[PDB]
Amino acid sequence: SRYKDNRPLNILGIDISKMELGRYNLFEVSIFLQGSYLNPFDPQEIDVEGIFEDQYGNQYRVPGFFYQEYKRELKNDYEYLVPVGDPYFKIRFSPINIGSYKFFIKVKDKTGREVSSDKYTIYVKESEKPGYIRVSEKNWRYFKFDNGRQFLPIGANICWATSKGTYDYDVWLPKCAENGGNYFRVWLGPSWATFALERESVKEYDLKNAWKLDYVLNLAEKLNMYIMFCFDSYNELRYQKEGAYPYWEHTPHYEKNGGPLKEPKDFWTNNEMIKYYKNKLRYIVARYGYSTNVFAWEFWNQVDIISPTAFVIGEVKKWHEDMAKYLNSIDPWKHLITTSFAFSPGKPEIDSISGLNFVQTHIYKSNRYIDALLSLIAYKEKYRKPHLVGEFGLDAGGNDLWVDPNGYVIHNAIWTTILSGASGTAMSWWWDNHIHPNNLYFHYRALADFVKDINFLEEKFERLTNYKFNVYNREIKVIGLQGKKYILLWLYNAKEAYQYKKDIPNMDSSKFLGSIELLIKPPIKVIYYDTYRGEKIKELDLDKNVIPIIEFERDLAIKIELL
Numbered sequence: 001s002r003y004k005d006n007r008p009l010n011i012l013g014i015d016i017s018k019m020e021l022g023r024y025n026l027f028e029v030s031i032f033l034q035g036s037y038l039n040p041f042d043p044q045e046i047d048v049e050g051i052f053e054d055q056y057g058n059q060y061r062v063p064g065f066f067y068q069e070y071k072r073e074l075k076n077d078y079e080y081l082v083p084v085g086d087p088y089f090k091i092r093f094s095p096i097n098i099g100s101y102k103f104f105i106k107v108k109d110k111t112g113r114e115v116s117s118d119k120y121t122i123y124v125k126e127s128e129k130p131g132y133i134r135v136s137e138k139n140w141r142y143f144k145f146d147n148g149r150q151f152l153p154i155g156a157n158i159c160w161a162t163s164k165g166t167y168d169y170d171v172w173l174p175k176c177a178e179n180g181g182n183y184f185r186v187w188l189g190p191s192w193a194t195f196a197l198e199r200e201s202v203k204e205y206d207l208k209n210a211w212k213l214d215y216v217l218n219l220a221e222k223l224n225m226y227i228m229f230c231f232d233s234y235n236e237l238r239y240q241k242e243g244a245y246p247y248w249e250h251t252p253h254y255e256k257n258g259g260p261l262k263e264p265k266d267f268w269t270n271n272e273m274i275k276y277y278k279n280k281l282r283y284i285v286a287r288y289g290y291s292t293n294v295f296a297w298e299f300w301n302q303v304d305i306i307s308p309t310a311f312v313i314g315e316v317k318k319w320h321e322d323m324a325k326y327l328n329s330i331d332p333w334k335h336l337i338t339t340s341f342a343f344s345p346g347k348p349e350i351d352s353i354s355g356l357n358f359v360q361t362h363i364y365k366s367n368r369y370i371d372a373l374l375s376l377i378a379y380k381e382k383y384r385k386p387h388l389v390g391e392f393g394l395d396a397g398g399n400d401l402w403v404d405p406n407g408y409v410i411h412n413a414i415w416t417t418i419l420s421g422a423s424g425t426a427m428s429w430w431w432d433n434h435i436h437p438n439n440l441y442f443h444y445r446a447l448a449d450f451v452k453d454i455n456f457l458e459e460k461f462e463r464l465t466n467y468k469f470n471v472y473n474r475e476i477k478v479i480g481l482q483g484k485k486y487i488l489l490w491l492y493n494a495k496e497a498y499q500y501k502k503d504i505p506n507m508d509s510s511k512f513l514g515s516i517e518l519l520i521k522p523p524i525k526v527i528y529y530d531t532y533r534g535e536k537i538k539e540l541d542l543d544k545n546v547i548p549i550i551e552f553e554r555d556l557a558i559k560i561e562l563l
């Protein structure tokens with residue numbers, strides 16, 4: 001109980017960031033107080049709240065959180081955080097409406113005494129921000145912002161840094177954002193992760209790592225990127241003898257390390273663990289919930305591969321239902337909630353829960369992964385909610401960077417997924433050893449430039465069917481979407497798409513290879529698109545349903561407009 005206090009409860013100071021701000025922007029209140037509490041992370045010991053009300057009478061109950069300021073520096077190859085000042089409490093709010101808001105601060109400590117502030121008035125003006133990310137009501141396959149514009153995630157996993165910490169995100173994120181990226185995923189566990197909140201304890205959260213997460217979230221805000229926060233990873237509940245990067249022996253949850261659990265199975269039902277997990281959720285909502293740059297709360301990385309002694313499907317299902325209900329009830333902004341599985345088809349008993357707003361796939365597969373992706377995307381349409389291919393790579397023991405230095409595997413997956421009806425791109429692993437050093441960002445820029453001018457929410461896109469190839473010298477395959485105005489095609493050479501030795505294509509496209517006929521009413525306009533340079537190659541108006549296929553080396557995109 002490092003941060004305990006034993007004084008009579010009193011507010012000592014309040015600092016307010018700004019009294020005027022824009023819609024969806026951060027409004028931050030700093031609260032200095034004294035009180036009686038053993039653990040500032042436990043609302044039963046001290047409960048700080050901000051109560052906000054808009055001019056329409058809508059109320060927001062925002063939990064406050066304990067905070068330490070730091071100043072970062074780089075000591076050769078590692079980030080070091082110097083504490084600045086005493087820790088204190090903060091409230092972070094974001095207005096969804098414009099106009100005036102009134103708010104006050106309330107604090108209650110373990111004695112039951114309550115203190116409060118005067119009522120303050122702030123004023124909110126219109127801004128450019130599109131709002132929070134939600135499921136689209138127009139097409140359940142996709143996400144939208146509150147303002148109605150689509151959110152198509154394009155990006156990769158960027159889940160932890162090296163010892164350089166936030167200084168790595170300073171490098172990776174600008175490169176991603178300048179190349180069409182608007183998405184990444186970070187891990188808040190296990191305890192070795194850059195942003196690990198439960199580092200030494202499951203009862204108190206790590207203020208240094210929380211500050212690093214603030215820093216990275218703020219960078220995402222400046223770059224218009226949106227983050228999935230993964231709260232826990234399977235390693236925490238996996239025994240050493242079980243392999244796969246196990247961490248149970250080292251995790252703070254285990255009684256050996258000060259936690260409540262005698263074995264990982266007890267995580268799902270242990271009353272003390274459940275209480276502290278809810279405190280962690282409250283801390284995460286308090287500290288990060290305001291941000292429209294939080295795309296989603298993800299409970300678990302690959303919960304199905306915790307120790308088999310600990311995976312009880314009915315218990316894991318009930319825990320997800322209960323935690324999703326709790327998280328939704330305390331999150332004033334109702335961020336999306338998800339969870340993930342290592343097994344590519346997922347766990348229907350969990351994926352079907354209404355509290356999980358979208359489903360995911362993880363897939364590491366070396367052979368015929370294009371067909372595997374299409375098959376999984378077709379299968380998961382049964383859930384009638386968005387599908388994110390949240391992890392993808394070869395099944396090559398992490399050797400993707402040697403097998404495919406040009407990123408053709410990633411290239412094939414991002415085109416296949418976005419033109420098969422997934423909510424966004426397949427999300428690659430290997431951000432630090434592959435995507436960045438091999439400079440693979442250009443693949444994303446080319447795809448973003450192809451999709452960004454179409455409102456996917458309104459096209460009524462369906463997986464392409466009813467096509468017929470007429471090609472004699474090559475085996476060409478297609479992944480496609482057919483909509484009310486556009487047909488989007490990704491054509492690939494089956495004999496070249498899975499070979500990765502040749503250099504990035506850079507050829508002429510003057511020869512006729514063959515044709516593809518589609519079920520559509522002409523006249524149509526056809527645009528041929530180089531998927532490596534990210535540029536239009538050729539435009540052609542046609543009065544028949546037969547699309548000529550121009551020469552290409554590996555793959556080619558075609559955008560067809562019904563006129």
Ligand SMILES: OC[C@H]1O[C@@H](O[C@H]2[C@H](O)[C@H](O)[C@H](O[C@H]3[C@H](O)[C@H](O)[C@H](O)O[C@@H]3CO)O[C@@H]2CO)[C@@H](O)[C@@H](O)[C@@H]1O
Nearest residue numbers: 160192193233235244245301302342362364391398429
């Ligand atoms: O260096 C940080 C940390 O790394 C841990 O090991 C990582 C591996 O380095 C590798 O990235 C591995 O990736 C998995 C990941 O689990 C993911 O969910 C997905 O299923 O597949 C990838 C590709 O295999 O992830 C582990 C962590 O699970 C570990 O070695 C730590 O000791 C070390 O600090």
